[PDB]
Paper text:
Mycobacterium tuberculosis possesses a Pup-proteasome system analogous to the eukaryotic ubiquitin-proteasome pathway. Mpa (known as ARC in nonmycobacterial species) recognizes prokaryotic ubiquitin-like protein (Pup) that is covalently attached to proteins destined for degradation by bacterial 20S CPs. Proteasome structure is highly conserved: a 20S core particle (20S CP) is composed of four heptameric rings stacked axially to form a barrel. Similar to the carboxyl (C)-terminal “hydrophobic-Tyr-any amino acid” (HbYX) motif of PAN and the Rpts needed for the activation of 20S CPs, Mpa bears a C-terminal “Gly-Gln-Tyr-Leu” (GQYL) motif for 20S CP gate opening.
Therefore, we used the open gate 20S CP (20SOG) in this study to obtain a stable complex of Mpa–proteasome. In both high-resolution 3D maps at 3.1 to 3.3 Å, we observed a GQYL density inserted in each of the seven activation pockets in the α-rings of 20SOG CPs. The presence of seven GQYL motifs of a hexameric Mpa complex was due to the averaging effect during 3D reconstruction of the 7-fold symmetric M. tuberculosis 20S CP. Unexpectedly, we observed two binding modes of the GQYL motif in the 20SOG CPs. In the first binding mode observed in five α-subunits (α1 to α4, and α7), the penultimate Mpa Tyr608 hydrogen (H) bonds with Arg26 of α2, but the C-terminal Leu609 carboxylate does not form a salt bridge with α2 Lys52. The GQYL motif was stabilized by two additional H-bonds with the adjacent α3 subunit: between Mpa Gly606 main chain nitrogen and carbonyl oxygen and α3 Asp144 and Ser146, respectively. In the second binding mode observed in the remaining two α-subunits (α5 to α6), the penultimate Mpa Tyr608 H-bonds with α5 Glu119, and the Leu609 carboxylate forms a lateral (horizontal) salt bridge with α5 Lys52, and the GQYL motif is further stabilized by an H-bond between the main chain nitrogen of Gly606 and the neighboring (α6) Asp144. The Mpa GQYL motif inserts 2 Å deeper in the first interaction mode and 4 Å deeper in the second interaction mode than the PafE GQYL motif. We found that each of the seven α-subunits have rotated by 3° in the Mpa-bound form, leading to the H0 helix to move outward by approximately 3 Å. The H0 outward movement apparently account for the 30 Å open substrate entry pore of the Mpa-bound α-ring.
Residue numbers in the entry:
A (entry chain V), B (entry chain W), C (entry chain P), D (entry chain c), E (entry chain Q), F (entry chain U), ...: 301 to 522
The structure:
Amino acid sequence: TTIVALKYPGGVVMAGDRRSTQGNMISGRDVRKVYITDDYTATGIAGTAAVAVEFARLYAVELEHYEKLEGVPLTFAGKINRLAIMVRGNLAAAMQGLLALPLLAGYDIHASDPQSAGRIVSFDAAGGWNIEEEGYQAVGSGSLFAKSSMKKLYSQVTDGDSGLRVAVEALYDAADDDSATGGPDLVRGIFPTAVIIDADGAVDVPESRIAELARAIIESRS
Amino acid sequence: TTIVALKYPGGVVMAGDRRSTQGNMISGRDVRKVYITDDYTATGIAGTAAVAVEFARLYAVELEHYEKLEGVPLTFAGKINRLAIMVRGNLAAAMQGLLALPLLAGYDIHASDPQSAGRIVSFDAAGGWNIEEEGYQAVGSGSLFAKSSMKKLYSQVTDGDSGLRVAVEALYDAADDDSATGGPDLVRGIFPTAVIIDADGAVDVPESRIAELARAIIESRS
Amino acid sequence: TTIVALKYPGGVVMAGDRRSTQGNMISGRDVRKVYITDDYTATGIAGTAAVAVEFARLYAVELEHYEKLEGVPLTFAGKINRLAIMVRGNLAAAMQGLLALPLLAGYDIHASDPQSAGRIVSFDAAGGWNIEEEGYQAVGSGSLFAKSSMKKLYSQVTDGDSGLRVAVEALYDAADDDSATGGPDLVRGIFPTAVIIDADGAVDVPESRIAELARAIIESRS
Amino acid sequence: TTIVALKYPGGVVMAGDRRSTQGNMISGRDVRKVYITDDYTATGIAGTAAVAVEFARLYAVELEHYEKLEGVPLTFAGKINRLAIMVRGNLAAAMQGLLALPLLAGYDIHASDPQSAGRIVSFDAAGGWNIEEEGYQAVGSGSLFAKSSMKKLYSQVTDGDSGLRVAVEALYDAADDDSATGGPDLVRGIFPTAVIIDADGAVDVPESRIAELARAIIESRS
Amino acid sequence: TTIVALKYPGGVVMAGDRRSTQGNMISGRDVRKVYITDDYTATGIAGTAAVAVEFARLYAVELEHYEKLEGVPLTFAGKINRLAIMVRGNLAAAMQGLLALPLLAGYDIHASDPQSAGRIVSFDAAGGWNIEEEGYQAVGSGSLFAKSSMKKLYSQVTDGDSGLRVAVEALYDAADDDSATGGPDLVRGIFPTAVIIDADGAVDVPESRIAELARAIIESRS
Amino acid sequence: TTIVALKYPGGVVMAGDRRSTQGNMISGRDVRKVYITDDYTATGIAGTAAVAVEFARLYAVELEHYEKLEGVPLTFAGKINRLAIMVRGNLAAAMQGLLALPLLAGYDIHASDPQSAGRIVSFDAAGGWNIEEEGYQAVGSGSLFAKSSMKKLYSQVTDGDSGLRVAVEALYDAADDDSATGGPDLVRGIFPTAVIIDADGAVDVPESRIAELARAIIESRS
Amino acid sequence: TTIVALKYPGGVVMAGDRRSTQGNMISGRDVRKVYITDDYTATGIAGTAAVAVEFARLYAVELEHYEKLEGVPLTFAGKINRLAIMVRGNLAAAMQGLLALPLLAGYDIHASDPQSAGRIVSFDAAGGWNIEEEGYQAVGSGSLFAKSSMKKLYSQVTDGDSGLRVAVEALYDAADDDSATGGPDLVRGIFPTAVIIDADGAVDVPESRIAELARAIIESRS
Amino acid sequence: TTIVALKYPGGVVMAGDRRSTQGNMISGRDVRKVYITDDYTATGIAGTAAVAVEFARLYAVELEHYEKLEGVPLTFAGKINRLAIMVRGNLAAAMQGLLALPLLAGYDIHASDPQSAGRIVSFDAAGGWNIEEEGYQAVGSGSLFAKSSMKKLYSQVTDGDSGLRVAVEALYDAADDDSATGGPDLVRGIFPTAVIIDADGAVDVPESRIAELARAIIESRS
Amino acid sequence: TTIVALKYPGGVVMAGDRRSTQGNMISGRDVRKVYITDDYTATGIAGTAAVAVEFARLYAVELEHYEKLEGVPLTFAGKINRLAIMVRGNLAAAMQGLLALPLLAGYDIHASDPQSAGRIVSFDAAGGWNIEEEGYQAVGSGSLFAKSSMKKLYSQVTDGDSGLRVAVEALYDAADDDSATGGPDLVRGIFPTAVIIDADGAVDVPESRIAELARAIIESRS
């Protein structure tokens, strides 16, 4: 599994692959690992697929619950803190095996600068969180290959479209070097999922744009 | 990894994938796992790549050594016995993780019937060997998927070409269900290696024919 | 044990073998593993027979209790969630050897199109659930062989009869390749149990039709 | 695996199943576990298949080696002693999982009464041996079922044909209660192997006779 | 220990041996293992004697307590469920050596056909229960020998007396092949205990009839 | 990680590096390890980054909570005792790897002599504290190198500027001999973070001054 | 440690870093890890520094010993085999912490096409070897980052100087992501060592040229 | 650490060294290990410094708490009992490493004879205590050497000054033979701390007196 | 224990402390750890005292043995290699507990520049060696403090006198921060042992000069 997130001028984008394995045997081919937690934040969890789905559901429920109760959404720092609390509370079971590494992408409406309101927060297993300043991050088994690909490709990111292309290319490299990450499947037409968050909210990227980006990348590599 | 072998009327065919992993990280993309041990026998060893190559080299050296010393090549049962002795003598080292499981394909030149001279020999962990009468066999991590694919496809095998197509399709199925087996990689043009043994001897299949078959299979499943 | 489920145009079919063993010794020859949980959903649990029976009973009581209390049945997502909760609760005992793996087949009456209202859900050991998109799934010790048989036979599934025949054939292949799975008992007249769910509900397939299909398959492979 | 041996007036018969398994997975269907060691001695070794084959080969070589060197065959007690020496020497390997349980059927030509010259010798793990006076013996995973059915059917044994039928029925009962023993496979036409030893020597029973007896037994059970 | 049960036209019969051992030492010669739990059901518990007596005591008390509270006896499925829960609640104590395996014979008065109203229920270690359909069952250390004897003798079971004879003979075979099972003690005049359940109720068999049956069996085998 | 603290005439200065590693892999480059706990005390925690952030946050919350509840800030000894209690209460979690060792620098506003009111408190693993009398202290992996550098450089400390320069040079030496401590980053423009406490309170040192000092040190070392 | 090797039109280049750490402490700042083994081969060992040095010495002595004894140098395959045998022999001590991971760069003077005569050989822990066709390879703790950097910069490689620049940039990225690999020390004037092999042989690259390349890279990334 | 305590006619004196170590590394140079628990009682705790400080604080708080609640101080036997209870309540921590061995010096005001009112109480790990009648006692790493020094020097103890001199000389011997005990530091001017308890209460000894005593001892030993 | 070595223009100087401890107990106060191995090399071994003395004696014997046999002394590289072979051979004992880490100082009479002929060779635990280019190196338990003292004091080294003073001060700092290192004993008159090597050879530094230097350092730090 690999999830990548990167900031572009005016927003953030998070993309993830679709493969689920049980050891070496491929058990899932259309898994979705990027969830729109709320109108301005998307979360993507690597590790055990079961724990990933549970954490996404429970974190979204917590954010919605607070917003409904108090009539105002949490600040981005509050969302970060609640996610870190979930990660810390998962520590014993993570040592036991049920492990989850989240990655959070968000848009800060309360930020003074709309252009630089995109935020990427990474979490370590102990519950600590770090707000990325380099403009990109990855989690999962193929995270190092994806990060080293984005390091070289990040100078091309100038809008949402180029950012999405770079994210898809990072996932492609991660799958090219790591067998637990699924590449773009042209036989089945299964492609990485992506979420773009800007000042207008968090919207799922339709499969058509991702499909044509992946096809262009595969043609370039050939 | 996966190596398949199957008998067709008039000979035997043996195909192998190209991927080698270290964990879930892909480390080799064009590993050759099928070796022409002698003019009428090919061997294919699954497991640790180092031990696989070492075993193939030692086995070929031993067979050629006997042929030079005694002036007559070993009978097929003699070759099977030598390979089984190697596998039995590697048991202790395989208990530490340097495991190797061979699969032997041959053309018995002393068999009365030329049309049923193909032989497939499978070796289990402890050094036992069985001459397969069902006509197909597979070794490796994707061996079960390849075997179950060949079980359904074996009624289409009538000559060398259809046998090769079925072997390539079995490798495709093994790669489809198992991440440690490499599928037909159209981006780099790396395709499974194959060897066909008939009355004329054992000859490597040119990469163009296997590429054509793999492309036809991919198109059919698209 | 092996339990297969597959979608056909207009519904779903779930079939299961009849053998239960204590190690290598056959201890039961007419075990029923496929339960009709409610009028539109059936479940099949592999693993320890005690835990399978207990889980089926508890799950059916849970669904019935909700339907009576609220006057309206649970949505398919609610049923999936309750089953996943049960599996996750079992995990602690499953590590001890009371492992139960369910497979859920259902007919979603709230779907837009009744021609594709069949649903198949697989569960992992940790509790994660996956709604199958390939149209077939299997659990049990012979699940790999059954799935590799259905992969090749699924192009023939057109109606309930085709789906039932393909399911019985997949169970036959699973029993043929796995000793813990029992094939059709021609001397005793014991055959796999199947359930067909369509718009009119979930109905047990009479043993006469399954006997006819099993005899046809055996005569085909002789 | 099950091998049975029983005495009839004027000789002995030894029969064996054909299945070999890898845990729960059926890996061999036409294995031969009964060997004609020499002109008046058959041996059948249960346990690990590789070790069984190696032990049969070694024992036959040792007997023929003594016969050629000393110009006279070993006495029956000498043969029993050599087999017991092999079993006692295999003790460490059996502790390492390379276990072998032999069963020896012979015809003592030097014995006084030619109508009671048959001899069945069972070997325990430690290398002890016992000449069976009950007139029947079994080794293997299903040996208890075979012995308990032979106890009830041994009153029907009067000649070679009745003895062969009783041996095949005992193997059938072993396969009925034990999943690691293969029953008569009427689909593939694979039947238990048998060797009949009498005053004229040891001959393999042709497959047609065993097929007829197996079909009769199956129809009687239906 | 060995306890057998078998259905006959119009009821069920359940017999048990009398020997209790602490290791290889015979400590009890007249232990009673078959209990009349209520007027239409008997239970026989193998394993440790202390836990067996406690289990029978508790089960009888529980059934009687329900009958007195509610004014109607439990249905047969209810009795099976209570016994199964009693078995399942003993997993922790049985892992320390306090294993108790029950076998339940009963007469379903609420069944449609009174001739096929007998029920034999066998429980496995984890608490699973199976209603035997073959007509006989056994528990204990000699259970396999008794079952294999009953498989051959069950065609002679035509009424209550022949069923009782077949049960006693199965016990004799189990005692013959297993040293933990006690045979008929002609010196001390101790014989297996038996209970017959039919439409009129459950009655202990008098010791004289069992004595004469055992004497007939012994004089047959002499 | 490495945090240094040192007194100068009329105050105290505390500096920390910015690198966070996971093993030998650099994961963070702008970590801030020095926190202004309250108007006159700063704290800096070495060890695990998650625990460091959580400890600093909780300690600041505790000090503020007491100040608001009682209307008066804690005495310096009270703050030391609270931090020591918080360190002692983490002894269980520190053994399993969530270690956090703090260093507390403060300006004792109740001290009689303004020019000697800077206080440095070091803590040990068991929660014991020591008010440093040598005038400097360090915590973290490079603490030994930092202390042995401050030993030689402390004669040059005379005011805030010289104290800040000596702290930065000590951090430079720690990074020069330790790879878990990050030195000045003249490519990314990341420099150690410092806090200066004196009679007017605790203020973060602007990055420009630290950049000037680090460049001067680097040019002196070339 | 990180050693990179890459092929360029007309030869091969091999660069390595200079840092040596024991745990986290930097114990060496000018280590040399690329050795000119012979006139057309450079070797570079990652892992334990002592084992690396002694392996380089043993390999050079072995190659020169063969050349002196037999009057002709070893073929490239022979050199690969000797290195692989050395690694396999070390395997046992490598489990004890004395690991050595070699990387071999050579110019095949007997190759048909001298423009493609450069060879890169990688070795796994088990002693197997692979000739890299991707044109680059890396060993050491930072080998993943170096490889993922070269994957994106290999297009630039057109001559010896372009290849050398990419090699230094790959080492820079490895040191940027990994704390066990040393970046270019502009303060001490310590830079990665490099060896260039072409038709004229293997020559050490002068330190000044690598200094210029490293300074250009640092300016580029500032 | 080493703490000595000796009686002289008319009172008691207790002295302690100043070194605190972390293994072989000196972590503290002016630790105060002798505390005035109350007006006529001093205590010195050896072992872990954190536990020593916590124990002294708790013990003093408890004594003052009782004196305030009751208006009368505890008797000496009561104080001994409270200290022994505190020791015995720390056995679990002592077994994991938080050892704390106290040494009590007191002036029994309720004693009959004013000259012999000094009391020295030694405690063991289990909580047992002894009122020492030899007139001196020591705890800590250098306790044995200090004991053996006081054994020879106690004949010179006649008044308070001679007792102080003997205590300082015993500490000097303990530091001379034990490297974890800190001797008089003439360079930093740090000397052992001492408390003299007499009929006028417990008084901290001025550092100047101990400095001149230590200098005289050093001169006499030169 | 601490042995320092440093280069000055025209030679090298190696000094060592005198303390030997058995745990916390000081056993020896006048141990000599610097040995004139031969007229131009001195060696100092830290760790177990027995192993240090044995290594020094054995190494000197080896060097003189070679010189007597071949009529010419070993080159400096040969001496380094012999010492490294001894260190590597001592690895089993070092794991057992007989650790010996050597430090070698020498004068290379064959050097191009007599002023740069001073050589310092540090050996790691695995036997690998490194010629220090820093100009200073320390071995032992206080080696880090000594090295970080010389890092600051090395600019003052301009001749033999300044180098000897810096070595003595580094030993003083190591003893100041480490309790296993013996500082200057002004009472017993025991001072570190130093050896100075220049073109005329290696000569022990007289005790009086080292005493004067130590007294000056102590008075400066007072």
